[PDB]
Write an enzyme that holds these catalytic residues in place. Structure first.
Site, mmCIF file in Angstrom:
data_model
loop_
_atom_site.group_PDB
_atom_site.id
_atom_site.type_symbol
_atom_site.label_atom_id
_atom_site.label_comp_id
_atom_site.label_asym_id
_atom_site.label_seq_id
_atom_site.Cartn_x
_atom_site.Cartn_y
_atom_site.Cartn_z
ATOM 1 N N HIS A 80 0.835 -1.207 0.000
ATOM 2 C CA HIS A 80 0.000 0.000 0.000
ATOM 3 C C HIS A 80 0.861 1.245 0.000
ATOM 4 C CE1 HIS A 80 -3.850 -1.898 0.388
ATOM 5 N NE2 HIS A 80 -3.590 -2.479 1.534
ATOM 6 N N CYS A 129 -0.364 -0.028 -4.237
ATOM 7 C CA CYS A 129 -1.821 0.006 -4.229
ATOM 8 C C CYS A 129 -2.233 1.314 -3.573
ATOM 9 C CB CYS A 129 -2.357 -1.150 -3.395
ATOM 10 S SG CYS A 129 -4.161 -1.254 -3.255
#
Ligand SMILES: C[C@@]1(C(F)(F)F)CN(C(=O)Nc2cnc(-n3nccn3)c(Cl)c2)c2cnc3cc(Cl)nn3c21
Ligand SMILES: [Ca+2]
Ligand SMILES: [Ca+2]
Ligand SMILES: [Ca+2]
Ligand SMILES: [Ca+2]
Ligand SMILES: [Ca+2]
Ligand SMILES: [Ca+2]
Ligand SMILES: [Ca+2]
Length: 373
Positions: A80, A129
């Site tokens: 992330h 992400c």
């Protein structure tokens, strides 16, 4: 003239097991396959999965300490990320929800530290992400000359689209980029990714004063203490324990073997290698792992390595064993002490005898650094 590397060093980070954020799966495969590529190009690679803020900062700082004049350095992150006002951030697995910059490592600061070195080539690759609605902000450009730099930044909006675009083996965007753009053809013998739905981006930026490639030779030394330090510091963070033949009191021999999957992930495996003629049946299993490693018994003692969650397939390891994957090795405080149990029956008898031996294997792999909080 021919460009040379003083050294070739790489750090690859894959974050998946997020506590307060949706879990990812893609990083594991892509870190492993990129590690394998870079290793064949003569890089010393550190490959780390599932890192906290503290672990990530120690890992990146000590990577940046290896960057010197002429060194070729590659940094890769997958997991992330977020973006705020031109500044992008890599999110550790212990990060609170919502994201705060204090908890995350800022990309641009790492980029500025890398370009402050007189490296021969810096490569920094991010496979993030993002949160669904986290697009790039409206910014001025307020604050890349002599430094040789390749900066690559991939985004997918949302974990769904991230995992979809990363589905498949062998198909990593940056692995394809490195093979196509950064490897000179005949200097090495090395051993589709359809565009999927959703919103995605790729940016690649480069500034090179001369042609540079990952295949450029290391300038080789016969008698350098610096080369020795560099090699030895990395190599001693990557020791596995040797295979053990554990001899139990009754005469049963269990072999216990070890494999590295990442710098912080070891596979262990057990097999019976002698059963005495008095004993008709036996079985063996491992238990009692340090609580810092966080081993779930349901992912231990499995009869293929695939079932533990490993990259390593049944062809890659000795066959017919029970396999256990010991991840999180950087969290080990003391020694990796565990217990091997034996269950056996004497010839003709129903009576099952239990026995056990405690194994100490020290500090395997990155656990040797002993760098925990
Ligand atoms: C020299 C090291 C070594 F790993 F090889 F020893 C040291 N180093 C680290 O990553 N170090 C590191 C330190 N502390 C932690 N940690 N664990 C728990 C708490 N702090 C962790 Cl996860 C990692 C790196 C990184 N990239 C590279 C590339 C090459 Cl080549 N070497 N190299 C290194
Ligand atoms: Ca070679
Ligand atoms: Ca902090
Ligand atoms: Ca934004
Ligand atoms: Ca993939
Ligand atoms: Ca010479
Ligand atoms: Ca300690
Ligand atoms: Ca009994």
């Amino acid at each position: 003239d021919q460009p040379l590397a003083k050294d070739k060093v790489a750090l690859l980070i894959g974050n998946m097991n997020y506590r307060e954020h949706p879990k990812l799966k893609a990083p594991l495969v892509d870190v492993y396959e990129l590690t394998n590529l870079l290793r064949q190009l003569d890089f010393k690679v550190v490959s780390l999965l599932d890192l906290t803020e503290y672990e990530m900062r120690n890992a990146v700082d000590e990577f940046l300490l290896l960057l010197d004049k002429g060194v070729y350095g590659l940094l890769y992150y997958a997991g992330h990320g977020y973006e705020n006002f031109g500044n992008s951030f890599m999110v550790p697995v212990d990060a609170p929800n919502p994201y705060r910059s204090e908890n995350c490592l800022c990309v641009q600061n790492i980029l500025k530290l890398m370009q402050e070195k007189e490296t021969g080539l810096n490569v920094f690759l991010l496979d993030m992400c993002r949160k669904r609605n986290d697009y790039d902000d409206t910014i001025p450009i307020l604050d890349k000359v002599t430094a040789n730099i390749v900066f690559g930044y991939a985004t997918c909006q949302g974990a769904e689209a991230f995992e979809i675009q990363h589905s498949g083996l062998a198909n990593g965007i940056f692995m394809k980029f490195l093979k196509d753009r950064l490897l000179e053809d005949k200097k090495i013998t090395v051993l589709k990714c359809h565009l999927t739905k959703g919103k995605q981006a790729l940016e690649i930026r480069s500034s090179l004063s001369e042609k540079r490639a990952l295949t450029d030779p290391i300038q080789g030394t016969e008698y350098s203490a610096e080369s020795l330090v560099r090699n030895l510091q990395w190599a001693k963070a990557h020791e596995l324990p040797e295979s053990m033949c554990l001899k139990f009191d009754c005469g049963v021999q269990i072999q216990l073997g070890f494999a590295a999957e990442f710098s912080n992930v070891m596979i262990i495996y057990t097999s019976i290698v002698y059963k005495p003629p008095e004993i008709i049946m036996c079985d063996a299993y491992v238990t009692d792992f340090p609580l810092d490693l966080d081993i779930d018994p349901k992912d231990a003692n499995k009869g293929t390595p695939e079932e533990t969650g490993s990259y390593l397939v049944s062809k890659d390891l000795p066959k017919h064993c029970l396999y256990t994957r010991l991840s999180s090795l950087q969290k080990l405080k003391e020694h990796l002490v565990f217990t091997v149990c034996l269950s056996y029956q004497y010839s003709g008898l129903e009576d099952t005898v239990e026995d056990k031996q405690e194994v100490n294997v020290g500090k395997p792999l990155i656990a040797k650094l002993d760098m925990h909080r």
